[PDB]
Short mmCIF file of C-alpha atoms and ligand atoms in Angstrom, two decimals:
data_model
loop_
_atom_site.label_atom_id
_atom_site.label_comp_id
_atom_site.label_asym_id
_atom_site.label_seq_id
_atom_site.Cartn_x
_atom_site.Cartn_y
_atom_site.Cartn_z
CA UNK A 1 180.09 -188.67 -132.35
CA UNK A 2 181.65 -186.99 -135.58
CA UNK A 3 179.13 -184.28 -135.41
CA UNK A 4 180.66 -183.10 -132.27
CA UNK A 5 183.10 -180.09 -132.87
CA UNK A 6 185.37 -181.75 -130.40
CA UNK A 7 186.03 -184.75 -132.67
CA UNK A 8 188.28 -182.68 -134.69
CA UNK A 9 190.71 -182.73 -131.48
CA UNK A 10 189.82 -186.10 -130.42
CA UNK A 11 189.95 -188.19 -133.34
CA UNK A 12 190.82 -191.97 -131.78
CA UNK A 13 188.38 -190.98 -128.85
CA UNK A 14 184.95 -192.03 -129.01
CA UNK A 15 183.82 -192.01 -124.68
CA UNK A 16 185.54 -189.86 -121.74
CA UNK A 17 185.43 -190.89 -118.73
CA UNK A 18 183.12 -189.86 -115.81
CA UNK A 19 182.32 -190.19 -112.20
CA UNK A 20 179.14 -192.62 -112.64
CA UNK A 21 180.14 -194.17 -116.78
CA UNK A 22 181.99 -193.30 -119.92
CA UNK A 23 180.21 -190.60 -121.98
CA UNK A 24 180.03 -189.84 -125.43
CA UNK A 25 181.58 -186.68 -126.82
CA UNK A 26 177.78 -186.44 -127.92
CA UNK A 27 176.19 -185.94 -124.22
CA UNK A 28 178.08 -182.93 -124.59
CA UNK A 29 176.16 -181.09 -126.77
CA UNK A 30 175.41 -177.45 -126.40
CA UNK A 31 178.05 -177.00 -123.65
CA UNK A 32 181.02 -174.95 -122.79
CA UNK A 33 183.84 -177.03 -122.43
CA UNK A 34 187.52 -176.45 -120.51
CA UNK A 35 190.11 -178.62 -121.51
CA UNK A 36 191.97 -179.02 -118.58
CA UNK A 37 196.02 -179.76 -119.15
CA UNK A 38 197.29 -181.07 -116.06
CA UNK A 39 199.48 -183.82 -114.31
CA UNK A 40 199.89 -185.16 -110.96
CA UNK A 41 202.98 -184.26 -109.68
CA UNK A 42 202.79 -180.43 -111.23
CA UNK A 43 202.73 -178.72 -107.92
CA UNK A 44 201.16 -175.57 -109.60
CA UNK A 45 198.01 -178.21 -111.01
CA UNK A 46 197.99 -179.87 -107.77
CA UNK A 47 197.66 -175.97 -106.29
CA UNK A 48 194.70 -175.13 -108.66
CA UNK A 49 192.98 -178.42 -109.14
CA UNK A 50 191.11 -177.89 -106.01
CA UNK A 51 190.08 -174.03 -107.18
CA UNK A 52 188.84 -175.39 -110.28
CA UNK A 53 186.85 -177.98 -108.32
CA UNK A 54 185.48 -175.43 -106.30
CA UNK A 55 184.35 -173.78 -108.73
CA UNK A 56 183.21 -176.48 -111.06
CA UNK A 57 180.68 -177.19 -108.04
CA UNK A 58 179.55 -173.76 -107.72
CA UNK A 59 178.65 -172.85 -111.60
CA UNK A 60 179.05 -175.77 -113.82
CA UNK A 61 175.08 -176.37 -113.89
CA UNK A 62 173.94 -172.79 -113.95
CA UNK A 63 176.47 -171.96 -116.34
CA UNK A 64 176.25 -175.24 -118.59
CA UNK A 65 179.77 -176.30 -118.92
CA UNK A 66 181.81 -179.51 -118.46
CA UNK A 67 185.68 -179.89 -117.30
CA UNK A 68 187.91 -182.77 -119.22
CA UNK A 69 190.84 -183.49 -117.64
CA UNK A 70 193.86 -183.99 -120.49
CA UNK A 71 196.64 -185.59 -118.02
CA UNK A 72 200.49 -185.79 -118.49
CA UNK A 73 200.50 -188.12 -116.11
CA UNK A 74 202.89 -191.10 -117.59
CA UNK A 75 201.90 -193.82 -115.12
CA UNK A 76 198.37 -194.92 -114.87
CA UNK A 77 197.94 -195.51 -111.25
CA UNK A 78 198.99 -192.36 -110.81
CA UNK A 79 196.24 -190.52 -113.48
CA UNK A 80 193.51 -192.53 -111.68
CA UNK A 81 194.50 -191.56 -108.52
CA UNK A 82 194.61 -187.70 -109.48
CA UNK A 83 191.62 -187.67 -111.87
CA UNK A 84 189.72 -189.59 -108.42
CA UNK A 85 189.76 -186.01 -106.85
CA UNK A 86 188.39 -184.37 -109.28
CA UNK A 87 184.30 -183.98 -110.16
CA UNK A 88 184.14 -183.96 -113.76
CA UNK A 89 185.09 -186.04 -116.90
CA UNK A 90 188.47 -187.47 -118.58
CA UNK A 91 190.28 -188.14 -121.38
CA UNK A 92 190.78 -192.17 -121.29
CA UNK A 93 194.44 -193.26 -119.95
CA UNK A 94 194.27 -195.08 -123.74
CA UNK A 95 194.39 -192.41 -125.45
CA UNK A 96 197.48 -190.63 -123.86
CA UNK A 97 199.74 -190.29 -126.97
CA UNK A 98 197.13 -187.39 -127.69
CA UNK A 99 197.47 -185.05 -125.27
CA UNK A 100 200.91 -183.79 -126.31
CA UNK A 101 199.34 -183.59 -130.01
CA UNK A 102 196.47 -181.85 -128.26
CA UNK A 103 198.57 -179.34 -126.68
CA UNK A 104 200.39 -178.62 -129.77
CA UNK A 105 197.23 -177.86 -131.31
CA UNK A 106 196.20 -175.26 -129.13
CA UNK A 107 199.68 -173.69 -128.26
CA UNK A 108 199.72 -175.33 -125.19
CA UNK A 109 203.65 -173.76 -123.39
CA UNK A 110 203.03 -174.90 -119.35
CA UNK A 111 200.15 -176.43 -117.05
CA UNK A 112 197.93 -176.04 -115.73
CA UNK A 113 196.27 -174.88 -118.83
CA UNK A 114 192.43 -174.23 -119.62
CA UNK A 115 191.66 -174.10 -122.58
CA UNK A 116 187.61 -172.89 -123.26
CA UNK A 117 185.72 -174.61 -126.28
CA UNK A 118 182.44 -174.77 -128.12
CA UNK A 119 181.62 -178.14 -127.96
CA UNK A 120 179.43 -178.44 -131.02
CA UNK A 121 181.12 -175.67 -132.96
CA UNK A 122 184.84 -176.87 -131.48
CA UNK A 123 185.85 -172.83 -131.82
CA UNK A 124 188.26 -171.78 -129.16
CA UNK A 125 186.62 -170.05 -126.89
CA UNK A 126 189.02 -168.73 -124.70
CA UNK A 127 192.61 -169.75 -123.74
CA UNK A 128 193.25 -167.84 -120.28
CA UNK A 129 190.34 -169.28 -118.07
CA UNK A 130 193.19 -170.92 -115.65
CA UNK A 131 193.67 -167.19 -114.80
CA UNK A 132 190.22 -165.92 -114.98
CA UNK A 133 189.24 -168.78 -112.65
CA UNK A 134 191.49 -167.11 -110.03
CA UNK A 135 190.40 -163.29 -111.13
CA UNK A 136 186.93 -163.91 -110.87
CA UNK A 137 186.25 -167.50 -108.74
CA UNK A 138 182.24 -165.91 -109.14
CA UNK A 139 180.25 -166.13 -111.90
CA UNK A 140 180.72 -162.18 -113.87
CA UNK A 141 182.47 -162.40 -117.14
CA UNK A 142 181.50 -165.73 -118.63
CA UNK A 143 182.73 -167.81 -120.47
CA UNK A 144 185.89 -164.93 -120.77
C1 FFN B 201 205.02 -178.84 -113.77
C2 FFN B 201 204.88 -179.02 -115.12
N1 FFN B 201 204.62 -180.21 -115.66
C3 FFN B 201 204.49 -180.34 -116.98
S1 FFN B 201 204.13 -181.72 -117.82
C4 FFN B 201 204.16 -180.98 -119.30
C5 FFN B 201 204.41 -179.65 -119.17
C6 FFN B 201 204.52 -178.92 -120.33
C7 FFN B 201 205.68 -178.18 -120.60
C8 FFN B 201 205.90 -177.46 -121.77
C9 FFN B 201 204.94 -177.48 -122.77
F1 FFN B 201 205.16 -176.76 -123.94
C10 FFN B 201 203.78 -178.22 -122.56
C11 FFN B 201 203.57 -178.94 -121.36
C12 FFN B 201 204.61 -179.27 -117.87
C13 FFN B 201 204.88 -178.06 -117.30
O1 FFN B 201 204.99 -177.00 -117.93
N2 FFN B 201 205.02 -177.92 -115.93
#
């Protein structure tokens, strides 16, 4: 809820989306988190959404950390579509305006961006991951 260090990104948001129901922000307590800046038709996220995935299946239990996917995707049919091949959680479609406010805030320039995050502290953890990911697809240097 507002003790979560991601509220202070999220502010309108109260649930993300997941595979099974919504979540709070809360359930993520004690995590790593990557905020995951990607769209549907970016050929480069549609490249790397799958390595991610990979990966995410591999580590995120051992290692403790969630994905949230933070779509440009414009049309909705689309973002449900894309976010369907992916494992882990999602900003809501309703809260859209956000994500360019979002990737102001954390100097966002192209996707597919990861950015890493505390998720009770909300420090920035790390803002390279989409290239560490690639670098070192095994568990070595975490979380980077
Ligand atoms: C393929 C692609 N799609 C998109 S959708 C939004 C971006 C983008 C571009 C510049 C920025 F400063 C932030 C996001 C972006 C991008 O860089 N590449």
């Amino acid at each position: 809820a507002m003790g979560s260090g991601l509220a202070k990104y999220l502010p309108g948001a109260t649930n993300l989306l997941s595979k099974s129901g919504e979540v709070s922000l809360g359930s993520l307590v004690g995590k790593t988190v990557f905020l995951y800046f990607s769209a549907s038709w970016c050929p480069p996220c549609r490249g790397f959404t799958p390595v991610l995935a990979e990966f995410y299946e591999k580590h995120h239990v051992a290692k403790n950390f969630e994905v949230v996917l933070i779509s440009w995707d414009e049309n909705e049919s689309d973002f449900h579509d894309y976010y369907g091949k992916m494992p882990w959680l999602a900003l809501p479609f309703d809260q859209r305006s956000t994500v360019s406010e979002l990737g102001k805030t954390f100097g966002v320039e192209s996707i597919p961006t990861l950015i890493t995050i505390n998720a009770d502290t909300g420090a920035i953890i790390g803002t390279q991951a989409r290239t560490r990911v690639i670098e070192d697809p095994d568990g070595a240097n975490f979380p980077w």
